[PDB]
């Protein structure tokens, strides 16, 4: 089954190379991960920390950094930005 990202998350996925408007959740997670990797946002020495600053992802989350080990805020953003 596919989900439809809402516009602010869709821009992020497109920035990471996603094409189109409909994706499986695994595909959403792949492209959102790709955004973080290709923009080198994770800390190379503490790779669960993501420093997004004021980029699209930091604006969407309302935070300049987050930890993949504490994913509640990510899951909140994903809930609000994926139409199942």
């Amino acid at each position: 089954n596919q989900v439809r990202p809402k516009l602010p998350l869709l821009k992020i996925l497109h920035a990471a190379g996603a094409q189109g408007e409909m994706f499986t959740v695994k595909e959403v997670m792949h492209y959102l991960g790709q955004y973080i990797m290709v923009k080198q946002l994770y800390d190379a020495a503490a790779q669960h920390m993501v420093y997004c600053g004021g980029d699209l992802l930091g604006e969407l989350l309302g935070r300049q950094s987050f930890s993949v080990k504490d994913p509640s805020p990510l899951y909140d953003m994903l809930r609000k930005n994926l139409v199942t």
């Binding site: 997670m29 991960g33 973080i36 994770y42 669960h48 993949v68 994913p71």
Partner: peptide
């Protein structure tokens, strides 16, 4: 542990 390995553990 790499970013990719941490990221793969997410399960929204």
């Amino acid at each position: 542990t790499s970013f990719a390995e941490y990221w793969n553990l997410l399960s929204p």
